Design an enzyme around this catalytic site. Sequence first.
Site, PDB file in Angstrom:
ATOM      1  N   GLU A  50      26.029   5.797  -2.236  1.00  0.00           N
ATOM      2  CA  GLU A  50      26.264   7.082  -1.589  1.00  0.00           C
ATOM      3  C   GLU A  50      25.463   7.209  -0.299  1.00  0.00           C
ATOM      4  OE1 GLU A  50      26.243  10.127  -4.490  1.00  0.00           O
ATOM      5  OE2 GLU A  50      26.740  11.753  -3.094  1.00  0.00           O
ATOM      6  N   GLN A 106       0.825  -1.202   0.000  1.00  0.00           N
ATOM      7  CA  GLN A 106       0.000   0.000   0.000  1.00  0.00           C
ATOM      8  C   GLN A 106       0.862   1.256   0.000  1.00  0.00           C
ATOM      9  OE1 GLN A 106      -4.237  -1.468   1.786  1.00  0.00           O
ATOM     10  NE2 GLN A 106      -2.868  -0.407   3.216  1.00  0.00           N
ATOM     11  N   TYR A 122      -5.128   4.658   6.589  1.00  0.00           N
ATOM     12  CA  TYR A 122      -3.900   4.237   5.922  1.00  0.00           C
ATOM     13  C   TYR A 122      -3.593   5.126   4.722  1.00  0.00           C
ATOM     14  CZ  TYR A 122      -3.244   0.005   8.709  1.00  0.00           C
ATOM     15  OH  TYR A 122      -2.995  -0.873   9.740  1.00  0.00           O
TER      16      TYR A 122
HETATM   17  N1  LIG Z   1       1.879   3.098   7.609  1.00  0.00           N
HETATM   18  C1  LIG Z   1       1.198   2.009   7.261  1.00  0.00           C
HETATM   19  N2  LIG Z   1       1.230   0.895   8.069  1.00  0.00           N
HETATM   20  C2  LIG Z   1       0.541  -0.218   7.721  1.00  0.00           C
HETATM   21  C3  LIG Z   1      -0.203  -0.262   6.551  1.00  0.00           C
HETATM   22  N3  LIG Z   1      -0.773  -1.488   6.472  1.00  0.00           N
HETATM   23  C4  LIG Z   1      -0.404  -2.213   7.557  1.00  0.00           C
HETATM   24  N4  LIG Z   1       0.402  -1.429   8.342  1.00  0.00           N
HETATM   25  C5  LIG Z   1       1.061  -1.795   9.608  1.00  0.00           C
HETATM   26  O1  LIG Z   1       1.712  -3.035   9.404  1.00  0.00           O
HETATM   27  C6  LIG Z   1       1.554  -3.879  10.525  1.00  0.00           C
HETATM   28  C7  LIG Z   1       0.836  -5.150  10.097  1.00  0.00           C
HETATM   29  O2  LIG Z   1       1.571  -5.752   9.063  1.00  0.00           O
HETATM   30  P1  LIG Z   1       0.945  -5.976   7.604  1.00  0.00           P
HETATM   31  O3  LIG Z   1       1.833  -5.402   6.524  1.00  0.00           O
HETATM   32  O4  LIG Z   1      -0.442  -5.391   7.519  1.00  0.00           O
HETATM   33  O5  LIG Z   1       0.854  -7.583   7.543  1.00  0.00           O
HETATM   34  P2  LIG Z   1       1.481  -8.446   6.341  1.00  0.00           P
HETATM   35  O6  LIG Z   1       2.863  -7.973   5.948  1.00  0.00           O
HETATM   36  O7  LIG Z   1       0.534  -8.319   5.174  1.00  0.00           O
HETATM   37  O8  LIG Z   1       1.624  -9.929   6.975  1.00  0.00           O
HETATM   38  P3  LIG Z   1       0.387 -10.945   7.210  1.00  0.00           P
HETATM   39  O9  LIG Z   1      -0.914 -10.234   6.946  1.00  0.00           O
HETATM   40  O10 LIG Z   1       0.434 -11.507   8.611  1.00  0.00           O
HETATM   41  O11 LIG Z   1       0.546 -12.079   6.220  1.00  0.00           O
HETATM   42  C8  LIG Z   1       0.735  -3.119  11.544  1.00  0.00           C
HETATM   43  O12 LIG Z   1       1.647  -2.582  12.472  1.00  0.00           O
HETATM   44  C9  LIG Z   1       0.082  -2.012  10.748  1.00  0.00           C
HETATM   45  O13 LIG Z   1      -0.068  -0.858  11.538  1.00  0.00           O
HETATM   46  C10 LIG Z   1      -0.235   0.859   5.728  1.00  0.00           C
HETATM   47  O14 LIG Z   1      -0.886   0.855   4.682  1.00  0.00           O
HETATM   48  N5  LIG Z   1       0.467   1.988   6.090  1.00  0.00           N
END
Ligand SMILES: Nc1nc2c(ncn2[C@@H]2O[C@H](COP(=O)(O)OP(=O)(O)OP(=O)(O)O)[C@@H](O)[C@H]2O)c(=O)[nH]1
Lengths: 437, 53, 337, 424
Positions: A254, A15, A224
């Site tokens: 760098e 995302q 998000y």
């Molecule tokens: N800044 C930001 N943080 C995100 C976003 N989506 C998820 N997170 C954060 O990422 C963490 C959760 O990990 P995810 O990336 O959603 O999970 P994943 O990597 O898809 O792993 P699994 O779903 O367990 O297979 C949480 O701490 C969320 O707050 C996003 O779009 N932006």
Amino acid sequence: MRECISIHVGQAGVQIGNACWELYCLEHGIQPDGQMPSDKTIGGGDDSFNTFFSETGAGKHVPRAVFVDLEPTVIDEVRTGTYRQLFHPEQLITGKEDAANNYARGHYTIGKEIIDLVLDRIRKLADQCTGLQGFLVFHSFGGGTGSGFTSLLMERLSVDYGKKSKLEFSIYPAPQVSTAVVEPYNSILTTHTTLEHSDCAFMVDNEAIYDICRRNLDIERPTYTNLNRLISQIVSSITASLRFDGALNVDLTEFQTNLVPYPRIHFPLATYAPVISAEKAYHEQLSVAEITNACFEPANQMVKCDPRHGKYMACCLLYRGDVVPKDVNAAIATIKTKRSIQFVDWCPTGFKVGINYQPPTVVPGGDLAKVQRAVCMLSNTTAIAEAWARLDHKFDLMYAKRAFVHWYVGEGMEEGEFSEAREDMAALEKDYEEVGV
Amino acid sequence: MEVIELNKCTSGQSFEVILKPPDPSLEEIQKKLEAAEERRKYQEAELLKHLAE
Amino acid sequence: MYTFVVRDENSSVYAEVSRLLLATGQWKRLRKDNPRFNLMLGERNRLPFGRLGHEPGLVQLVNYYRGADKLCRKASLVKLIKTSPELSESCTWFPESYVIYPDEREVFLAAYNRRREGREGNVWIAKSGILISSEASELLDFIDVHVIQKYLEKPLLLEPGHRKFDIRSWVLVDHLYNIYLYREGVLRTSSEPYNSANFQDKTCHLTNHCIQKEYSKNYGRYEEGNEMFFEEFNQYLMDALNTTLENSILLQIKHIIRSCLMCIEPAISTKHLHYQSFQLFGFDFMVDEELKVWLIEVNGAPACAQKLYAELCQGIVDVAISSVFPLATSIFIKLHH
Amino acid sequence: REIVHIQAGQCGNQIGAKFWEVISDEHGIDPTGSYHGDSDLQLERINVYYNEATGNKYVPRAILVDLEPGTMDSVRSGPFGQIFRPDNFVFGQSGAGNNWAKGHYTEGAELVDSVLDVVRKESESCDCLQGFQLTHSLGGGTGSGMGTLLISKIREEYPDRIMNTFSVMPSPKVSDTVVEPYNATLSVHQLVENTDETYCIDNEALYDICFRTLKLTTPTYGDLNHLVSATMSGVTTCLRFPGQLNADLRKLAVNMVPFPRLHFFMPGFAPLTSQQYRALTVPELTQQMFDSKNMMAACDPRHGRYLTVAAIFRGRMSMKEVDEQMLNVQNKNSSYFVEWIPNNVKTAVCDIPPRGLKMSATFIGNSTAIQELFKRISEQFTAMFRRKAFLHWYTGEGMDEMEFTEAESNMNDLVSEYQQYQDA
Ligand SMILES: Nc1nc2c(ncn2[C@@H]2O[C@H](COP(=O)(O)OP(=O)(O)OP(=O)(O)O)[C@@H](O)[C@H]2O)c(=O)[nH]1
Ligand SMILES: Nc1ncnc2c1ncn2[C@@H]1O[C@H](COP(=O)(O)OP(=O)(O)CP(=O)(O)O)[C@@H](O)[C@H]1O
Ligand SMILES: Cc1nc2ccc(F)cc2n1-c1nc(N)c(F)c(Nc2ccc(C(F)(F)F)cc2)n1
Ligand SMILES: Nc1nc2c(ncn2[C@@H]2O[C@H](COP(=O)(O)OP(=O)(O)O)[C@@H](O)[C@H]2O)c(=O)[nH]1
Ligand SMILES: [Ca+2]
Ligand SMILES: [Mg+2]
Ligand SMILES: [Mg+2]
Ligand SMILES: [Mg+2]
């Protein structure tokens, strides 16, 4: 010209990757259909923007990017969104079953079954590169995929691209946004396994982005999309030097040279200003000195911490907009007398400064107002160790009772990897202490 | 306050200001991956043995 | 219902402060390691400031200023005054001091010879269990991290008794960095006459309370506990020296307190920080024959006079704690700036 | 990510029937499985529980099991009887006589294989099956004895799938036979081993809520089942409607269960009005959902500690007030949450409210206070087992006393394991 391949892992990485490439297209004048009218060398060229975009005979500018997630909900939104035309199917990798917030499930159980496919799709992009620099890897600390599969991919990348640099954009977990109780476990596990494989990692605490969105953008409950648009601005400021004409941070090497004297301490702090609400409609433009002064305010940092109680090892200032060297030097002289800025004795007390005249572009209809000048400070300060301390403490609370450990052992991970990972973090925290005494 | 290495181009400008002077092999990876897979395989066998009882 | 935690059991001041908090029916105490607290009465050794201000929905406050040790450690104070332009090496209210590791060894001797050659007052004192001597050789062999400082050879002596004293001022700095000086101080006096020719008799040269109880000839002879409050001391200066405590001494004390605290404000302020700090300080001053005030030391973990624990401890609650967490004639002197 | 539903026995089928009646209404699906909704939010995650038959008719992915036909005939003749797949009615004729041994070892064994055939048939039609949810009581014979038999054999065929149960715990206040503590003790051990998440629904709590709160003099099973179906709808809100969180049973278990055996949850619901037109504020919703009187396990949470807590808010409401009130109830009562699991309270929201309510809140607590439910059953078990009372009903089906001694022993171990994570 040397190409850079971007890799986005898990929901957070994918995302955020979507927001970044959207901003890239706006900055470079690339339309959602991939056409770039200002590019007069159709189907080729070694311009600065070609480090991130390849070209087809039809004139389409295709991002040098791969998206990897173990469930197709998120990545299906890319292949159906505004910029669906930019990417071709081979660039999007989706599994059927995700890592369920479990590092071990993402690293061992599911990782082993899809790693070869990912490396093959990456090898395909590499084949298009005349001089690959390395990779930019976006992912979360807390997710099972973002933590578990990234660490596996970073190991193999070190194996298959030994001389290539690897930089990280890592989302540090914050309960305001958190999605799982075990995210401290996953953060520590993936840092321990990735530490020797990452040359430079930019950590972003969701707590900091969240608060910035509430105070500066007056968004009561930031989403998000709010968070990722602000993060993409920071990422854009950091990668601008790879995509535009310039002389500072012109290749991935760098970044290590300018920001990471000690290899293990490769987590520079990012500070961005100004962040202005788009609902204002008439904001007084901040000056070079004022936005430079804001770089030393904790409330503007990507990670909440107090750099007054640390030592600087390096500092870069990346300006975009109406900025001339004269004003920058004037602001630095003023801020140096007012503020507390201590460098390690074995490092010069100085600032590398980069200026791009094109002011920051904002997505139309977004929350960020367009400004005449913006700055992103990249400072490698020991104060960021406060974030490791917070994380390690929560880890220690749960691990003392072995809470949730059975979920990881059940995936084939040994309980000893917990203690090894935590022990590695204890050493990391000690490295920072010696540097910033 | 010294300004050094000033570079100018149409897109921007860069310089430096000084205020004060001063891995595991592929086989090893697939090893630990297979080791973890065997531990899962063993745990599942114990379960099926338990259910067989 | 506000929540606080107690992480310093030895604190006399905050043991009473916690007593008053619970006594308001609106504050609740938690375990030592419960992170969901509004207020932390933290320990004085390695307080984890890095873990404050990250609890969503909790305004968190702590009773110590991270970085205030520079002012409250004897070696740090000398370095802070020498290298701070706001204070300057020419600082007129701080005795000529030198920091030395068991470095300013050649610079201490540089001015020492001028005092022995000119037969001037060459009495110095080593601090960090201290040694008052008039010979550099004897001072350095005792060191083998300490600081050496000119001994005030012409201190102000209270009569009757011909005795030495020191003044303790309690200063409270709140989250807004307002500087509040407790209107009530204490003089910690020695009972024995000041012997200017015997620098080994610590009883007549050290005003410490512990030294006077177990090492004195007339402890509590003139005032109970070798502690004279501003009432008696002011009346004395009027009767004996024809001046007031405010004019002859308190103006300088307020000046010194402001100078020190405003010097480090950019380094310790929590104005734009994710958590807030306040802290109670103990300033110790020395007065010479000419009614000149000298800054002896500053301690950030000070105790209070038994007669003043109530007044001062509730002053803490009202100015530093309730000002951030409301509940439904000030005893402090706000030093403006 | 499909879920296969199973309802077994009298209690299991009557509660299961009302469950599908409730959520079928929330998704705008009529008794003929024909969708007549209003919002696309209804259909976004409809596949988790429903199969889409040709013609855009939706068929619950549910299997109805019983050892006698009476209850499933009334279901087939009930309100939403026609919506169920006819081939998914699997039943025998002998019944189980409120006897765990008959459900688990004799009568049930004769029928279990055909249930597995229907289960296997539903799984094959799943793009990516994630697990199962079983509704049943523990005090009877079919739901308790054959239900646990089913769970064991399902685990054998699908060992990497999540097993979730809504298990109705018996109570002398609301009892059919004296042997219920025997059946419940034998089943609880099965659940300890062979489920990942079990919602403990105490018939005693359901009765007290109907009598004291709802002012229902002389509650019936129907009244009891209204509380349960409303609670089951809330508890599964994430699995059925679009939201930040995905319909994921594994992620739920990963965050709710810090230790494998301690997976027995206290469900709660709010509001519970005797007044039904008055609007509830977010503070009121939050205060009630944490009040013991709104919980379904007849355990005092003040008597134990929360390992983890999941909360669901349904309806159009201030998200800012929700976060504030949730953070408030924690920070004001932080002593009842374990301090060695940071941030162990998760909050979920869903714009679509349940039928007849402007807003709703559902509570899912993993509390160590649940031990007093198991201790309650253990006391009743021992009162009879001391004298071997009523055992002949079970030894007549081939069981022996040692298996009862072992179940009692396993039960007391479960209680002591809870005791160690609360006050030593
Ligand atoms: N800044 C930001 N943080 C995100 C976003 N989506 C998820 N997170 C954060 O990422 C963490 C959760 O990990 P995810 O990336 O959603 O999970 P994943 O990597 O898809 O792993 P699994 O779903 O367990 O297979 C949480 O701490 C969320 O707050 C996003 O779009 N932006
Ligand atoms: N330069 C100096 N000239 C004269 N007397 C001095 C002096 N320095 C220190 N003293 C005397 O020594 C006593 C103790 O010195 P010191 O500053 O170390 O107090 P202390 O820190 O040991 C206990 P506290 O923290 O309560 O002040 C002072 O009260 C003062 O009377
Ligand atoms: C399927 C489902 N129904 C729910 C109803 C309520 C609810 F709150 C969560 C619900 N989940 C759910 N679904 C997901 N997809 C998740 F990732 C997830 N995570 C989660 C759960 C509990 C905690 C803890 F804090 F309570 F421990 C932390 C993280 N929970
Ligand atoms: N809440 C509720 N409990 C029930 C219902 N029917 C039976 N019970 C309870 O279930 C237990 C009896 O088991 P039952 O399901 O009737 O036996 P089975 O058909 O062999 O599974 C007793 O504890 C009853 O109190 C019902 O409709 N609702
Ligand atoms: Ca081109
Ligand atoms: Mg995911
Ligand atoms: Mg002292
Ligand atoms: Mg019955």
